[PDB]
Structures are given as C-alpha cells and as structure tokens.
Amino acid sequence: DPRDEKVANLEAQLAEAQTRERDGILRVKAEMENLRRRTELDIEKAHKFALEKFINELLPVIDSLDRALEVMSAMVEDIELTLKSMLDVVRKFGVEVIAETNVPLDPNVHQAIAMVESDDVAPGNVLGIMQKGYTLNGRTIRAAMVTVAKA
Amino acid sequence: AEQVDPRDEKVANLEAQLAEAQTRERDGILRVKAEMENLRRRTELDIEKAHKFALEKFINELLPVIDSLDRALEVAMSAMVEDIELTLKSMLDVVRKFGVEVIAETNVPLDPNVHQAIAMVESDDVAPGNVLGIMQKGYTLNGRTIRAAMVTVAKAKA
Amino acid sequence: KIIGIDLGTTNSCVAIMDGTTPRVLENAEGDRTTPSIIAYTQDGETLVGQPAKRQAVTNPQNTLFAIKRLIGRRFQDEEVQRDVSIMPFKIIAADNGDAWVEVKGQKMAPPQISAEVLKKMKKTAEDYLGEPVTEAVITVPAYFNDAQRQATKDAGRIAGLEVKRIINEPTAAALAYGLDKTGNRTIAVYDLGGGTFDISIIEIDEKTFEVLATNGDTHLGGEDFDSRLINYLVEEFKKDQGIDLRNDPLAMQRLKEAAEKAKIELSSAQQTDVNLPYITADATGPKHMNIKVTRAKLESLVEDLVNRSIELLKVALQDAGLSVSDIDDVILVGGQTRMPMVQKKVAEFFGKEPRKDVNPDEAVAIGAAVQGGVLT
C-alpha cells in the first residue's frame, strides 16, 4: 500500500503533465492561427481602404485629361490614348465610368444639375454629361453630374 | 540506498518517467511559446510592409500613364500644353500624396539604388560620374524603388 | 532552417519552408528574384543584384556576371576560352591553372564572387526569419562535374553557409512540383533561362531520382530572344527612315529595354508599341520611333530559337530511347518559358501540356528549399 498508493498518484501526476503539455500546445497553436487569420483581415481592410481613398483623389486627375481633351489633330490623338490607358488601368481595380446618356435619371448613378428642352431623347432620360461618374465594382463612388431632358 | 526489490525499482521508474514528462512539457511548451513570439514579429512586419506598399502595384501600373502624358509633351494650341502640363502636375503631386517621390535630379553622383546609367556622355557640364541629364523619371514608394530613373552619366572633357 | 538557394546563372532566388508550405522570400528591394551580378564600384563599393546591374554601362570591366560559366573550370575549356572573347570582364588563368577573374588588378577565384550573391541570399532569409541562418541547399546543372559542384560548395563556405547538400537543378524543379510520393514517373524538365537552355529527362524510380538524358544550349535564352526583337527594330527603322541606331549607344541601350518590355508585354497581349520619341537625329532633323509588334511578328522573330530548343529535345529522347509517351511528366523552368509559343511548341512535341502550376523562375529554388526541407 505505501508504494501502491504512491505508484498510482505517480501515474496520475504523469497523465496530468502529459495532457497538460498536449493541450497547452494546442491552445497556443490555434492561438497562433487566429493571430494569423486576424492579421490578414486587418491588412486586407486597410488595403481596400487605401485603394478607395487613392482611386478617389485620382478621379480629379482623370477629369483633367477630360477638360483638356475638351478644349492639334495628332496631339489629341495622344491625349485620347493617354485617357484610354488611364481608364484601362483603373478598370483593373474595379473603377468603371458612368456616362451612358439616354438612360432614365437614376439618383444612384446620376445627379441632374439642370434640365433642358430637347427632342433628342424622350423626356426624363439623361442627356449630356457635365461630368463623368465613377463606381468601383458598381458601388457608385461619384455620381455623373448630368442634364435631364425636359420636353 | 538498496533497491533490489523490483517493486522499489518500479516506483523508481515511474518517478523517472514523470521527471522526463515534466521535462518535455516545460520545454515542449517553451518552444511553442517562443514559436508564436516569432509569428508576432512577422505579423507586425507583414503589416507595416503591406502598409508601405499597398498601392505599389497600382501606382506602378500608372507609370506608363504618367509616361505617355509627358511623352505627349515631348513630341509637342498653347493652352492644351499648359493644360497637359497641369495634369501631369496633379498626377505627380497626387501619387506624391501616397508616399511617392520622383527621381529626376541631375548633377548628383550616380546612385544605382535609384538610377540607371543608360549611357556615358563626354561632358564637362558636370563632374565625371554624376547624372548628366535624365531620359526618364524614376519613382520610389516609401523607400523601395518602383522604377529607377534612366539617367545619362558624365565622362571627362575628352 | 535550411534556406533553399537557386544560384542561377542570370538570376538567383531563395526559399524556406514555412512549415510544410514553400515560401519564396524576397530581397531588400522587394524582388523575389535577385540578378546574379556583382560589381566593384570605382570608389570601392561591392554591389550585388539590381544595383549592380544598373551601373554596368558606366563600369563594364568591374561589373561581373555569368560567373556560373566559370565556377568549376580551368583557364582552358571550350566554354572558358570562348567566354574570354565576349565577357566584358577580365578572365585570367589562376596559378593552380583554374579560370579566375581580375577586377581592378586584384585576382579572385570564381567562387569568391558567387559567394557575394549567396551572401545576399543568406542575409535575405535572415532578414525574414529574424534569426541568423547558416544552412542551405544550392542547386547545380545536371552536367556539373565534381569540380564545379565542389567549387559551388566553396562559395557557400565563403558566405557562412554550410551546404547541407547540393542537389540538381532538374531534380530541384521535380521536387518543386510534387514528384516525390503512385510509384514511378518519367519527367522532362524544359529549362529555358536568361542565357541558357538545358533539357533534362529524369526518372524518379519509386523514391529515387535519375538523370536519364541531358542536353541543352550554352547560347540560348531570353537574352537571345531579346536581341531578336531589338534587331528587328533596328532594321525596321532603317527601312522606314534610313538610319542605323546600332551606331548609337544611347539609342541602342534605350531600344534594348523597350524591346525587353515589349517582349514581355507580348505574352499577355496581341500587339504592343515600341514608342521611343526623339530616338535620334540626323541632317534632316530629329527622328522618333513608333513600331507595332504583334505576338505574331515577335514569334516569327524568335522561331528558329524555339525550334532549336526542340530539335535538342529530340536528341535528348533519342539518347534516352523513348517516345513522348514514355514521358509521364514535363515541367518548365525559366521565365522565358512564359512565352505562349514555347509553351505550345513544347506542348506539341510531347503531346501532353507541360505543367506550370509552379512559378517557372521560383521552381528550382523552391525545389531546393523542400529538399533541405523537413528532409535534410
């Protein structure tokens, strides 16, 4: 009994430290995986965010190319190529443009700034783009200022 | 301390295993502790990195757009030019907002960290070895070079 | 940790297994691939990689490159002597009678040079893991005589790297894809590099590895596919404008890169534009270059070089007495294999499509990482 009762508690003492190591490992090993999975999130957010702010301040720069292409015959053929690639490059990041005319007004995409008599499009349909609109992946990021056609 | 009784060397054995067990555990728990300490050092880096160079791929795909723009000023109605000169200025000034600086400064020694000698030219306009003129702007994003400038280095008088 | 290292002739890469998953590291500049160049600046600086490539012009005689072409050879050899004719740097004979190089009057052994690059890789892995590294696997060409494999070993020592095993480049790509574990596969690694094309047919008798047949070229890789486009352009200009840009250093160096940027763009596009304003000038005023190159023209320009590869792909199997059928697997290695036309022309001579699920320029480096991996 003096050693039987001791031989038992020894065995236990061993299962404890055994499983205690096993589990302890696991907790820190799944603990490390959350740290991982959680930093990806945190990097992929601050990125989606920087990508949006950038794409943003860049819009006026495209507008510049427009205002300019809109005020020589081979020079322009250039500004039109610069422009196409500006846009081509951007598409790559989800930025598309709103400037399809003859579409019913849609406050989600358009911002009418003036109405005008015309027969060029049934009334109510956007006509004339005072400024092109943009959207990344659809979420309208800047509404195309437009001129709705009034009969 | 006699221990010929097998039952005594049995208790003496269990006593040893457990001592081993305790050993493994202690250390086996220290390496998996240190092991993550290392993963925390990285996550921080990976983060501070993706912060500095998030836009690098984008702001790298626009270089050829800054290029056709000034290229269009090179081959170069007075307004259209001041117009496309102002654009190129907002563009540059904007990417500069996001940590980009433009490598385009002459009379400085050639620095292969952000310079690409594209040719030696016999000139006294500047000290031998310095960039003599730039063929094409070079851009850097937060420290790392995204495109070295293509410079023209200078060689002695004749 | 046994950081795996691919000590290329034109570029080198370094990897380490993140657990069981291969993780190709990236240098200080943010490149996963570091050119194998090393220059000793006039002022005594020892540049390596990108920076060293960037000051080559201004410093041809002290910007060493393609040192792998000399690593384990004697001052005499078809290779060595015939290099002495093109290498802008001084290749002298060593007292031992080995092929060496002289930079600014000082004479150094080929290995002493490569070590500079290994040095940079070791520092690159160290910069990642945090802890110093001291162990690695370095890859060599399946035809490397004991002399080179060893001299390739001396390089590591000089760099603080205990070469825990220098395995084959072909084997490297095989281990890189997953040809280790049904029970017997026959692989053929198509290796088109920056300057060299080497083909290897190896047998992984299941898990053994065995070079069954090896053949390749010493003068045949991208850099040669490049000179095709460059020239096309020089000739085209002459036809459309009566000028020889060759005569011109500034214009040539300029056209070279454009051609290079063109050649790469023409593999994800159908045509691109070599646009070089103020390319030159003459009695009739300034000249501008604007050409259109199509996947097709380029291809037409690089044909006999892609076919020259295959004709060698033919004698590689004739010596290994097998048909494209006996070949159970064919892998590609060499950024230049990214060109559709080679991908194809090869997919046709072997029937089955070559596999490239793994980066053509990181492959062999990754192979080398997995070997020294949990294995060594």
From Swiss-Prot, chain B:
Effect recorded for residue 150 to A: No effect in ability to interact with DnaK
Site (Interaction with DnaK): 144
Gene induction: By the sigma(32) subunit of RNA polymerase.
Alphabetic keyword roster: Chaperone, Cytoplasm, Stress response
Effect of residue 71 to A: No effect in ability to interact with DnaK
Effect of residue 116 to A: No effect in ability to interact with DnaK
Keyword DNA damage: no
Keyword S-adenosyl-L-methionine: no
GO cellular component entries: cytoplasm; cytosol; protein-containing complex
Result after altering residue 49 to A: Great decrease in ability to interact with DnaK
Domain of life: Bacteria
GO terms, biological process: chaperone cofactor-dependent protein refolding; protein unfolding; protein-containing complex assembly; response to heat
Subcellular location: Cytoplasm
Impact reported for residue 74 to A: No effect in ability to interact with DnaK
GO molecular function annotations of the record: adenyl-nucleotide exchange factor activity; protein domain specific binding; protein homodimerization activity; protein-folding chaperone binding; unfolded protein binding
Family designation: Belongs to the GrpE family.
Subunit structure: Homodimer.
Protein purpose: Participates actively in the response to hyperosmotic and heat shock by preventing the aggregation of stress-denatured proteins, in association with DnaK and GrpE. It is the nucleotide exchange factor for DnaK and may function as a thermosensor. Unfolded proteins bind initially to DnaJ; upon interaction with the DnaJ-bound protein, DnaK hydrolyzes its bound ATP, resulting in the formation of a stable complex. GrpE releases ADP from DnaK; ATP binding to DnaK triggers the release of the substrate protein, thus completing the reaction cycle.
Protein name per UniProt: Protein GrpE
Residue window of the full protein shown: 34 to 197 of 197
From Swiss-Prot, chain C:
Family: Belongs to the heat shock protein 70 family.
UniProt keyword annotations, A-Z: Acetylation, ATP-binding, Chaperone, Nucleotide-binding, Phosphoprotein, Stress response
Keyword Metal-binding carried by entry: no
Function per UniProt: Acts as a chaperone.
GO MF term set: ATP binding; ATP-dependent protein folding chaperone; unfolded protein binding
Superkingdom to which the source organism belongs: Bacteria
Residues the record lists as N6-acetyllysine modifications: 107, 238, 297
Residues that bear Phosphothreonine: 196
Induction annotation: By stress conditions e.g. heat shock.
Transmembrane segments: none
Name of this protein: Chaperone protein DnaK
